[PDB]
Write a protein that binds this ligand. Structure first.
Ligand code: ADP
Ligand code: ADP
Ligand code: A1A0O
Ligand code: A1A0O
Ligand code: MG
Lengths: 289, 287
């Protein structure tokens, strides 16, 4: 898509995405006596909490045996604030040929909780995981639209009120809250373990297959995983084809997709500022149309 | 340092870095070279990128500082635009800091010294500081340009979006005091990068690099305010710079005025986290 436009506008046969590293933290690879390691540094005061949530997320994904992610090694307090997180170094290129395989794996990951050796019947998580540098509440809830409205959308919009005092966001949210249960089409939603931040910048591949990293995990609706993948692009079509061969789109998928993308726009407004006010409000208005 | 801390916590004799964003775009390997692509999906994207292209071109024309070469601005289906530029292998500014200090002082001296002389403050097109378009209307007088097209623009947005009483009253008092900071000094228009914080500078094996400009002709000292206020520049950058352009009398108080602009811009971009520094800087200017 964007790659097709670039190939045409620039006149290139090939086009391979590549590549301190990251938007939240600084990341560098080091060679050590025991092997290569990768180290993320964040100087903010909440850094340890963020990295401990990433450690818990990595451990939950690794326990499934369905996807490859870096092994977490150590979280280290930094003099003068913040923390460093050391993990296994992985040789990686951007996701291309392994996209359909990753689609299969992410669908199996979401379906894992329905396997007989998994018993999680509520939405949430056993510990705090951060969306970027913003701590999230993962308090267990039986009802997914309640969990998502309260501990994702409302939490972001309360931060928008505090920091931006945005009248339009407040007024639109009140109207949207009324609509949210209708978007679920009377469906029974079952918990699915999510990577939680499956942007194209957080997936990659090597010669064995795809790799994913930087998770912010919780038990959620499987569909929420795909919203960030779709809105910022970067995943080949074959990723989604393989995924939906295993988990078909339930009724109302397209409208829930807007609701889940809304969360990501609000989170980008809080992290990155007013640039993201227009898509946030615009998505709310589209849901209310 | 952190490297010693890592050596100790991991219990390793060696710790050898290898392998060497900001909510922009991605790098792509292309048949004709590597390229770097910035994506902005909003409707104002093209205008913003055209300002960046114009800023990069004005800086490139001096031949004094290395910037990425702009290639193409492309309209995106479904809104916004992509900006393709030459890819540069880039590391954080350290060993080339002193060189960058020299080059930025030469950049600021280029206008008065060259043969074609821009004799007003402003720019020939709109350039954005971050995501906010600036008015660059030519003005003979720098305190007028800065008060109207930088400080007042920001404070009008703060009145609109926050209705902040304290900002309003402090501005009423501060506005009158601004000329005192400039009396008895000659101000010559100087081409500025316009957004020289530490995250917009880098280096490679050949020398320093600067990028993401928001250029205009301004007072040279304004350039340094964001560099100082958010840190990240080695002392040798400022030492080299001020060997060529020493601090004129009143430098520290003008520095507060210029940092105020940046605090207000951060309040408009990121919200009330920056209200306290904005108001506080105003109070320091009024003491
Ligand atoms: N375990 C790892 N080994 C090697 N490289 C990594 C590893 N994890 C991440 N990377 C590289 O670092 C980049 C950013 O990492 P990420 O964990 O997404 O940081 P952030 O939370 O700051 O966005 C990735 O694009 C990838 O190239
Ligand atoms: N021309 C380029 N070549 C290679 N890397 C680049 C180039 N431009 C930017 N980058 C990378 O992107 C980062 C942010 O670039 P910037 O232009 O400041 O984007 P933003 O507008 O999102 O802040 C830089 O620190 C650098 O690592
Ligand atoms: O930062 C992230 C993704 N955005 C970065 C800049 O714009 C393009 C995509 C993710 O890690 C996450 O969705 C959120 O920002 C928390 O950091
Ligand atoms: O982003 C910028 C600088 N701030 C980033 C986060 O906090 C530290 C400094 C600059 O590009 C510009 O001055 C403006 O903030 C719009 O982005
Ligand atoms: Mg920048």
């Amino acid at each position: 898509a964007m790659e097709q436009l670039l190939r045409a506008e620039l006149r290139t046969a090939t086009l391979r995405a590549f590549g301190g590293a990251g938007c939240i933290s600084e990341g560098r690879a080091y060679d050590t006596d025991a092997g290569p390691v990768f180290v993320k540094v964040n100087r903010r005061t909440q850094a340890r909490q963020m990295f401990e949530g990433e450690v818990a997320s990595l451990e939950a994904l690794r326990s499934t045996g369905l996807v490859r992610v870096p092994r977490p090694m150590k979280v280290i307090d930094l003099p003068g604030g913040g923390a460093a997180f050391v993990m296994e170094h992985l040789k990686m290129k951007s996701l291309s040929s392994q996209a359909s395989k990753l689609g299969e794996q992410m669908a199996d990951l979401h379906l894992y909780n329905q396997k007989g050796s998994s018993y999680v019947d509520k939405f949430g998580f056993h510990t705090v995981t951060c969306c970027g540098f913003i701590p999230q509440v993962n308090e267990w809830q039986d009802d997914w639209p309640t969990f998502f409205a309260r501990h994702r959308l409302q939490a972001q919009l309360d931060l928008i009120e505090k920091d931006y005092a945005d009248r339009e966001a407040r007024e639109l949210w009140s109207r949207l809250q009324v609509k949210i249960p209708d978007l679920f089409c009377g469906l029974e939603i079952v918990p699915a373990l999510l990577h939680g931040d499956l942007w194209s910048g957080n997936v990659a591949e090597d010669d064995v297959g795809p790799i994913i990293y930087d998770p912010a995990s919780f038990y959620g609706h499987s569909e929420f995983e795909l919203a960030i993948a779709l809105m910022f692009g970067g995943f080949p079509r074959s990723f989604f084809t393989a995924y939906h061969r295993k988990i078909p789109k339930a009724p109302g998928f397209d409208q829930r997709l807007l609701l889940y993308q809304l969360f990501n726009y609000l989170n980008h407004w809080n992290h990155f500022g007013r640039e993201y006010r227009s898509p946030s409000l615009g998505t709310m208005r589209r849901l209310l149309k």
